[PDB]
PDB file of C-alpha atoms in Angstrom:
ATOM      1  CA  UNK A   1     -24.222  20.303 -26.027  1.00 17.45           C
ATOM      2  CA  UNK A   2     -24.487  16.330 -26.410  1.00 18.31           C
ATOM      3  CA  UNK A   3     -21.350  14.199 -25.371  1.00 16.29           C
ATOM      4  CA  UNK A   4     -21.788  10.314 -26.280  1.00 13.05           C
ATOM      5  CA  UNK A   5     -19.469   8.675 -23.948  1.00 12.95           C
ATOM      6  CA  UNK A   6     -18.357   5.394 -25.280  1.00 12.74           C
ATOM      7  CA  UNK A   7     -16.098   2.034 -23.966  1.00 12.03           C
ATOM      8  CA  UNK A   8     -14.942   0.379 -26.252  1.00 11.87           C
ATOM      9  CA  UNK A   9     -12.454  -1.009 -23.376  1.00  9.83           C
ATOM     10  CA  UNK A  10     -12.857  -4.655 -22.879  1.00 12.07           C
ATOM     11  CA  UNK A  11     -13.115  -4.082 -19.066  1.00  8.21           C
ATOM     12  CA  UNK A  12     -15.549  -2.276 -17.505  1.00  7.74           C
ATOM     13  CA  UNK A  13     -15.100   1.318 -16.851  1.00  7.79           C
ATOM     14  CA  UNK A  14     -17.237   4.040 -14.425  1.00  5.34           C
ATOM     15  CA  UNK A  15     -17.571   7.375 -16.619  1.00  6.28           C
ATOM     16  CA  UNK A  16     -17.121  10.200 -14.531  1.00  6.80           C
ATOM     17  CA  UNK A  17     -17.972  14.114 -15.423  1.00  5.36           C
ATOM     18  CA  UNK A  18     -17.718  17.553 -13.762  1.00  4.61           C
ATOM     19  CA  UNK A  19     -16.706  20.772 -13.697  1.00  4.84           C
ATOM     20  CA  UNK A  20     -14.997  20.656 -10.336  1.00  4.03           C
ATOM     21  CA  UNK A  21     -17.723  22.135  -8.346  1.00  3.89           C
ATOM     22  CA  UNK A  22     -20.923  20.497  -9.606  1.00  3.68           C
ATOM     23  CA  UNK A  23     -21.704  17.371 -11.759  1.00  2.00           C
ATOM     24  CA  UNK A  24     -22.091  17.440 -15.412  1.00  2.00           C
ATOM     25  CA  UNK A  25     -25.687  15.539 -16.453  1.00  2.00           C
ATOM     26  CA  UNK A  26     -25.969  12.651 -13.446  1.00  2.58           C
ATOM     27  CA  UNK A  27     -21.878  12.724 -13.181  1.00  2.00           C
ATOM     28  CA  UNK A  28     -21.209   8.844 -13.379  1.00  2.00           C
ATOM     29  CA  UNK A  29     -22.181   6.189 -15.149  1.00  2.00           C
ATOM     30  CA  UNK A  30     -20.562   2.463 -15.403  1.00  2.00           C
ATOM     31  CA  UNK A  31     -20.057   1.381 -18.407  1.00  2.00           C
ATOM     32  CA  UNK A  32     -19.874  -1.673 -19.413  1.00  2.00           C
ATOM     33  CA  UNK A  33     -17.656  -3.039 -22.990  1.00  2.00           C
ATOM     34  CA  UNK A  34     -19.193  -1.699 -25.617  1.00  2.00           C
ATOM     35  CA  UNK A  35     -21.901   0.768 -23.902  1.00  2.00           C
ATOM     36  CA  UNK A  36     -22.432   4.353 -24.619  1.00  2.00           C
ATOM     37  CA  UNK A  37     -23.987   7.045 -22.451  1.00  2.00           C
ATOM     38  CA  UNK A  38     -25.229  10.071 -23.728  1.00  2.00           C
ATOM     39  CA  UNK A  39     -25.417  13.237 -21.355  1.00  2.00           C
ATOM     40  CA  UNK A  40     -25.759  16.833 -22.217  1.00  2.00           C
ATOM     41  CA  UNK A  41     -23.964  19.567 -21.293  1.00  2.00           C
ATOM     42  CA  UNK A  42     -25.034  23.582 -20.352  1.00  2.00           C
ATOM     43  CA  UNK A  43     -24.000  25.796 -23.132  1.00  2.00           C
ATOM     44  CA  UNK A  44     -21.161  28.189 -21.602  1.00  2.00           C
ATOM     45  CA  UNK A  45     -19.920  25.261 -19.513  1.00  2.00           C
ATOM     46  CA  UNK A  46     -16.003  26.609 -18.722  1.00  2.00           C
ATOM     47  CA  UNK A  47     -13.652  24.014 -17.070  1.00  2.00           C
ATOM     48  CA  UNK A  48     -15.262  20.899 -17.583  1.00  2.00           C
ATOM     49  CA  UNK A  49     -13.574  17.271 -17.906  1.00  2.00           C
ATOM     50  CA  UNK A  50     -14.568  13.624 -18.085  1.00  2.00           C
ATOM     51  CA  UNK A  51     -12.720  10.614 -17.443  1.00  2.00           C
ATOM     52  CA  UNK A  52     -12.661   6.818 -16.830  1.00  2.00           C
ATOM     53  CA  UNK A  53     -12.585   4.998 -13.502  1.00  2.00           C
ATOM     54  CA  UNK A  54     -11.102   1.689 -13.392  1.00  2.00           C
ATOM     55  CA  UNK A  55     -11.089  -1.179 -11.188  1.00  2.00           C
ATOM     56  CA  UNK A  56     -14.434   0.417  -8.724  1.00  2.00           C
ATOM     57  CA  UNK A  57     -16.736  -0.732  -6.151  1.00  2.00           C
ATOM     58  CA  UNK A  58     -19.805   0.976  -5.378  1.00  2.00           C
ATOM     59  CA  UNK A  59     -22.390  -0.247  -2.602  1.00  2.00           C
ATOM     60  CA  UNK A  60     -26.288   0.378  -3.560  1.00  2.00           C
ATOM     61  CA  UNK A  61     -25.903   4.333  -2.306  1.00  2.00           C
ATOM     62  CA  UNK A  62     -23.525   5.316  -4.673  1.00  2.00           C
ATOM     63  CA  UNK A  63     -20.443   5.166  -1.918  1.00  2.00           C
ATOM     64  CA  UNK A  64     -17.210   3.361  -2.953  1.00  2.00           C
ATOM     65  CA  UNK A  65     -13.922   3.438  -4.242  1.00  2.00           C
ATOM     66  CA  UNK A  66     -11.783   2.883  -7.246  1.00  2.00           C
ATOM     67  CA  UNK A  67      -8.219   2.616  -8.237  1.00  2.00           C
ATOM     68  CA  UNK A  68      -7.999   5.254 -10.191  1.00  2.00           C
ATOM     69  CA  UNK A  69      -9.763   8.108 -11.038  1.00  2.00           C
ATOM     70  CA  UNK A  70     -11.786   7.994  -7.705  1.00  2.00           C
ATOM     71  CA  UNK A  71     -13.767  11.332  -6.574  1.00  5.12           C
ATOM     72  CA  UNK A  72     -14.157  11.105  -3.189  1.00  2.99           C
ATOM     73  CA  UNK A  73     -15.742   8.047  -3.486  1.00  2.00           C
ATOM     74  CA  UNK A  74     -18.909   8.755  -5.256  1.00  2.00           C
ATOM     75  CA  UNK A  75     -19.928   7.441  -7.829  1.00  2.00           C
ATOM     76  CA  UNK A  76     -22.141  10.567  -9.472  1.00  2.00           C
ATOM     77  CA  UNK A  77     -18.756  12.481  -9.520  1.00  2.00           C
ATOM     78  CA  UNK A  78     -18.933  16.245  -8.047  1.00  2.00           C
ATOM     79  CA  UNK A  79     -15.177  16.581  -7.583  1.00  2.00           C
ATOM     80  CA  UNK A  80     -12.274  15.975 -10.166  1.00  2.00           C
ATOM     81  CA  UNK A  81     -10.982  12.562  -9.918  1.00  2.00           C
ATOM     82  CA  UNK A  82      -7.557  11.921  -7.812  1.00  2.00           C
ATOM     83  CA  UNK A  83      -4.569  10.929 -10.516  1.00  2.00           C
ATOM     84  CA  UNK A  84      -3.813   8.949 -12.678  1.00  2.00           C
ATOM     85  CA  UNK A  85      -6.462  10.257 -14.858  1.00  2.00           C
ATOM     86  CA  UNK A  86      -6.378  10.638 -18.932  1.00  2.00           C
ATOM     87  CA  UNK A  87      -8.250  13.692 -19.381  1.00  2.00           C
ATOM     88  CA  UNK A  88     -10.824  15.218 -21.776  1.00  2.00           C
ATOM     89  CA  UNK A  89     -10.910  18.893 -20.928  1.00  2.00           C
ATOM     90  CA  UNK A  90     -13.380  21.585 -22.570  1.00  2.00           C
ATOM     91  CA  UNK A  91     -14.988  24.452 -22.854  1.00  2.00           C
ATOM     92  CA  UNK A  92     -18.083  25.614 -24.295  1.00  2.00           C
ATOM     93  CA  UNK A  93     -19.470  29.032 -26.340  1.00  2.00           C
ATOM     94  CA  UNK A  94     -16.430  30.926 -24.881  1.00  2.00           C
ATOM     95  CA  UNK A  95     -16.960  33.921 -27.520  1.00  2.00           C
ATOM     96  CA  UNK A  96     -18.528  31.689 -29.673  1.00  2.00           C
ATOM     97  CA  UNK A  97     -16.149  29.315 -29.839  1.00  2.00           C
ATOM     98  CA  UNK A  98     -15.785  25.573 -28.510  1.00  2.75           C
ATOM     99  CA  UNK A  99     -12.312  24.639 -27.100  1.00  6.80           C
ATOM    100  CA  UNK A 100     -11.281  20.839 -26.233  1.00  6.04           C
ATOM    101  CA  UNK A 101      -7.870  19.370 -25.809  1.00  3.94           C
ATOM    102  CA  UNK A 102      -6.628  15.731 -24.070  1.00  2.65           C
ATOM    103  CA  UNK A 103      -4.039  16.257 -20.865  1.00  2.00           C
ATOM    104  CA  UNK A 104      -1.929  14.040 -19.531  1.00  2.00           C
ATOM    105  CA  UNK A 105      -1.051  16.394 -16.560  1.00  2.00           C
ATOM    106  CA  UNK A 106      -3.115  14.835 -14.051  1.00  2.00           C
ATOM    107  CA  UNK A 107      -1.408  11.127 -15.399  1.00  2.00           C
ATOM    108  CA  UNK A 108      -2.470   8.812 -17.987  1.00  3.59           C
ATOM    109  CA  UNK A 109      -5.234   5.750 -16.962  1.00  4.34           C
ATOM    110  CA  UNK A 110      -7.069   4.630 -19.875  1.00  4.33           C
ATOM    111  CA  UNK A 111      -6.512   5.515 -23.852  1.00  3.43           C
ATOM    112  CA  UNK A 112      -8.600   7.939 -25.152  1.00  2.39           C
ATOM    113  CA  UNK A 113      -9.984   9.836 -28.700  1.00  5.53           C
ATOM    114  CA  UNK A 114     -12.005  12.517 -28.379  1.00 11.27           C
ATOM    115  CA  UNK A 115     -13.855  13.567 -31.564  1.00 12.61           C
ATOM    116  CA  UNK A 116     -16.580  16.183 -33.087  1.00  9.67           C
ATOM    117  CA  UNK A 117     -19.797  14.413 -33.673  1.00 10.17           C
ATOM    118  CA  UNK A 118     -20.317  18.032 -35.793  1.00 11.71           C
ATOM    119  CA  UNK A 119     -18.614  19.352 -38.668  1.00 11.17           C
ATOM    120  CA  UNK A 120     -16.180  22.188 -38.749  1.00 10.41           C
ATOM    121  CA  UNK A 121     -12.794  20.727 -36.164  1.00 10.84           C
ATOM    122  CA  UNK A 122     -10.994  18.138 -36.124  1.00 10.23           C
ATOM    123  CA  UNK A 123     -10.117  15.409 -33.041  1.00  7.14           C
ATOM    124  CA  UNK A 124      -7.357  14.372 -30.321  1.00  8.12           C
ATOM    125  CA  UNK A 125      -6.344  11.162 -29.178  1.00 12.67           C
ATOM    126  CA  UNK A 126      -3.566   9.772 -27.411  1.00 17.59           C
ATOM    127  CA  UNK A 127      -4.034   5.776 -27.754  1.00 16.31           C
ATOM    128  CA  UNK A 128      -0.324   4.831 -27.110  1.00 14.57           C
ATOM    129  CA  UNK A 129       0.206   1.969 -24.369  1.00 12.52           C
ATOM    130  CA  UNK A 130       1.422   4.736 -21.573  1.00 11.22           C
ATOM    131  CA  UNK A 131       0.907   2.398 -18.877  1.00 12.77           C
ATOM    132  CA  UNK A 132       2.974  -0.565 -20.738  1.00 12.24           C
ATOM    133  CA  UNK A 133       5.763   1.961 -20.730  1.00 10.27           C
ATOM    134  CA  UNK A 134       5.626   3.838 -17.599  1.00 14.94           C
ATOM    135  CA  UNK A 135       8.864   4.919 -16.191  1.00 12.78           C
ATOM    136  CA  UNK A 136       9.331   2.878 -12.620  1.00 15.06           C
ATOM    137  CA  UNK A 137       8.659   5.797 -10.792  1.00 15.06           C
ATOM    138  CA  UNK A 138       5.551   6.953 -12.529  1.00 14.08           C
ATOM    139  CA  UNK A 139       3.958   3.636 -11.981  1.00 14.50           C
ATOM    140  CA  UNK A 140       0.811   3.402  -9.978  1.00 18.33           C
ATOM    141  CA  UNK A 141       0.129   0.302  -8.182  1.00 17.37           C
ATOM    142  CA  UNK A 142      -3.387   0.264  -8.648  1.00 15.50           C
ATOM    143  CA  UNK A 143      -2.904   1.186 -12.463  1.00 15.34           C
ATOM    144  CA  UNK A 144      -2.026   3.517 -14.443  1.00 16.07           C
ATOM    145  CA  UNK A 145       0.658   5.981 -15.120  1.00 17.20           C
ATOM    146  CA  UNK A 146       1.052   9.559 -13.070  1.00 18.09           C
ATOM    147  CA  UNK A 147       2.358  12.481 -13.566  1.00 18.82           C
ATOM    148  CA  UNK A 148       5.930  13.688 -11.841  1.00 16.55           C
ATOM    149  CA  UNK A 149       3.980  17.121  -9.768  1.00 16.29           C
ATOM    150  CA  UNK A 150       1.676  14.460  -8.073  1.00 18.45           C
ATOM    151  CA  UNK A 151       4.537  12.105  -7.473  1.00 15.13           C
ATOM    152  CA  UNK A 152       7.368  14.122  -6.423  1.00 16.83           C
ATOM    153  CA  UNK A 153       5.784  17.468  -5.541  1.00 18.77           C
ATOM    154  CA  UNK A 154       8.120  20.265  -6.685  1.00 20.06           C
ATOM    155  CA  UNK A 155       7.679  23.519  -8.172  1.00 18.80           C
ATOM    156  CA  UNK A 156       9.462  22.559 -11.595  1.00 20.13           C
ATOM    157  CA  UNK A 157       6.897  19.616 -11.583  1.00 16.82           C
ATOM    158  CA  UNK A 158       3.914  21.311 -10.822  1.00 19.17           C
ATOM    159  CA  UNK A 159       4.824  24.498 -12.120  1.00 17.43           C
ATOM    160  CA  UNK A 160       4.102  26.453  -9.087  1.00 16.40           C
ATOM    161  CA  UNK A 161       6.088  29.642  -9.924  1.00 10.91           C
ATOM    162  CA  UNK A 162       4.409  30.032 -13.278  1.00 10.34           C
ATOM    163  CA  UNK A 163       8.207  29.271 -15.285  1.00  9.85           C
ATOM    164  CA  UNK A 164       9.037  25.894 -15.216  1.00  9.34           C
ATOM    165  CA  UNK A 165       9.980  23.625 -18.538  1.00  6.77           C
ATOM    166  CA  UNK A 166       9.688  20.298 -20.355  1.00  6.71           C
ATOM    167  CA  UNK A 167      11.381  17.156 -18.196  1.00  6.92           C
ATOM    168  CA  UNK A 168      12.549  13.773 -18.738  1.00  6.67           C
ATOM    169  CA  UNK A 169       9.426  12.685 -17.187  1.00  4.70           C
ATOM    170  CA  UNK A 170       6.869  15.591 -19.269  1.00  6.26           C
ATOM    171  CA  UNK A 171       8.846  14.678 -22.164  1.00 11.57           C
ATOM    172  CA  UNK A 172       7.910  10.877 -21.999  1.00 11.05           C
ATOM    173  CA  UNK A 173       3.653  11.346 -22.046  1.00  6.85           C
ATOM    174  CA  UNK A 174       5.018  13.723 -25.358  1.00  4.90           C
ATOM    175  CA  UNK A 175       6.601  11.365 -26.873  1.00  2.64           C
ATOM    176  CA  UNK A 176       3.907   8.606 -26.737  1.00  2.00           C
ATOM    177  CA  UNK A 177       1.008  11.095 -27.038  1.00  2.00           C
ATOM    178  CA  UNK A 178       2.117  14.410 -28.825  1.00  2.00           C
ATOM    179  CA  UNK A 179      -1.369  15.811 -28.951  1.00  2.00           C
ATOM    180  CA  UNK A 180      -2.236  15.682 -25.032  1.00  2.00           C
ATOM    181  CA  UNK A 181      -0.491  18.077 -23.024  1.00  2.00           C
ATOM    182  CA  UNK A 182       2.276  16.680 -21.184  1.00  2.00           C
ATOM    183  CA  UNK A 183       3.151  19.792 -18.507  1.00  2.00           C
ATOM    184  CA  UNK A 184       1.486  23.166 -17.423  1.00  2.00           C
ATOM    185  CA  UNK A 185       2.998  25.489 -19.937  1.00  2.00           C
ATOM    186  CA  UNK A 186       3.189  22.687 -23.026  1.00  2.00           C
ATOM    187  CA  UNK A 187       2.908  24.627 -26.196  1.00  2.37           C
ATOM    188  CA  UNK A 188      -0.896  24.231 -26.594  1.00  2.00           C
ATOM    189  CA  UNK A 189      -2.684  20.953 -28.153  1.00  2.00           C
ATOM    190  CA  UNK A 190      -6.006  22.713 -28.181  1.00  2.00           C
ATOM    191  CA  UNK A 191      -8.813  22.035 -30.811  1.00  2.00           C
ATOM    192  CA  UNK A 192     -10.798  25.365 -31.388  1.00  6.37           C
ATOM    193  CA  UNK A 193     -14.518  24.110 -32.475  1.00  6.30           C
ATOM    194  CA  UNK A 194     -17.520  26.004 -33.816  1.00  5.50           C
ATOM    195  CA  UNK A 195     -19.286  26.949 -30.714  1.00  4.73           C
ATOM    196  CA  UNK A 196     -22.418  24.551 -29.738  1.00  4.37           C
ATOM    197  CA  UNK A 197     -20.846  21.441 -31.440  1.00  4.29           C
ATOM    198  CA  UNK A 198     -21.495  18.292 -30.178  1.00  4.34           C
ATOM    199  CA  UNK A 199     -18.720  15.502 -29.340  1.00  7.75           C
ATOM    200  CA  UNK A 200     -18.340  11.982 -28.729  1.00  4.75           C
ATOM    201  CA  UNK A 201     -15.143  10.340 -26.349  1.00  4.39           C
ATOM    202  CA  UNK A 202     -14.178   6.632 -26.958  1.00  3.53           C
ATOM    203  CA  UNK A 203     -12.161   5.149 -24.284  1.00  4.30           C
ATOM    204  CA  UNK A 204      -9.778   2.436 -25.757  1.00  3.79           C
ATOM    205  CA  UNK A 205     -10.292   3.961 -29.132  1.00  4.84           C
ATOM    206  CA  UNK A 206      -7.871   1.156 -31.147  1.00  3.85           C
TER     207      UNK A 206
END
């Protein structure tokens, strides 16, 4: 499958992609305002994600860090990025069928749309100003907005047991951003796509 990765951001941002254990296409890219990278993706890819990185700094090997989003410093990602990170999640020609969905479990970084370039679904976005808003104790100080399980660490956060439910904290990324999941067992936000479409995500989409 093709993914055209656009910023329309007016800072920079560093693309990253994976599917936890291996890169997707080269795995980073920066990307300038307005730029667009086009990478392709296996058919029967399961798991994978892509995000942005903001605020990075990479030496001529690829070694660095950034604020947030960071994955383990590389800058080819090979790893899932460390929170806050706005997530597009998917997965491919799983019985035929695509699936994609936005989370905001892992935090919220940058806005985000994420769109068929094919016919037959429809998009997600959440585009509100999470940061802007971020309860105090959500706020990162390098940016962004995290989640309460990577802040405070308890089972009803992170959902350990299997049984947890919505909080005040799950229950503010829903109310800003109703089609991203905000917590592990959120009724599900997922897009079901003709398998083998083809998708485009927009950072800063408005």
């Amino acid at each position: 499958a093709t993914f055209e990765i656009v910023n329309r951001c007016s800072y920079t941002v560093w693309a990253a992609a994976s599917k936890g254990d291996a890169a997707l296409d080269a795995g980073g890219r920066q990307l300038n305002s307005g730029e667009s990278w086009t990478i392709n993706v296996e058919p029967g890819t399961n798991g994978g994600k892509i995000w942005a990185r903001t605020d990075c700094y990479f030496d001529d090997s690829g070694s660095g860090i950034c604020k947030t989003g960071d994955c383990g410093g590389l800058l080819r990602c090979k790893r899932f990025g460390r929170p806050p990170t706005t997530l597009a999640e998917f997965s491919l020609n799983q019985y035929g069928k695509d699936y994609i969905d936005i989370s905001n479990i892992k935090g919220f970084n940058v806005p985000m749309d994420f769109s068929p370039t094919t016919r037959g679904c429809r998009g997600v976005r959440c585009a509100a100003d999470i940061v802007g808003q971020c309860p105090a104790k959500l706020k990162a100080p390098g940016g962004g907005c995290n989640d309460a399980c990577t802040v405070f660490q308890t089972s009803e956060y992170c959902c350990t047991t299997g049984k947890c439910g919505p909080t005040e904290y799950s229950r503010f990324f829903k109310r800003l951003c109703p089609d991203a999941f905000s917590y592990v067992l959120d009724k599900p936000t997922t897009v079901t796509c003709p398998g083998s479409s083809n998708y485009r995500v927009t950072f800063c989409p408005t």
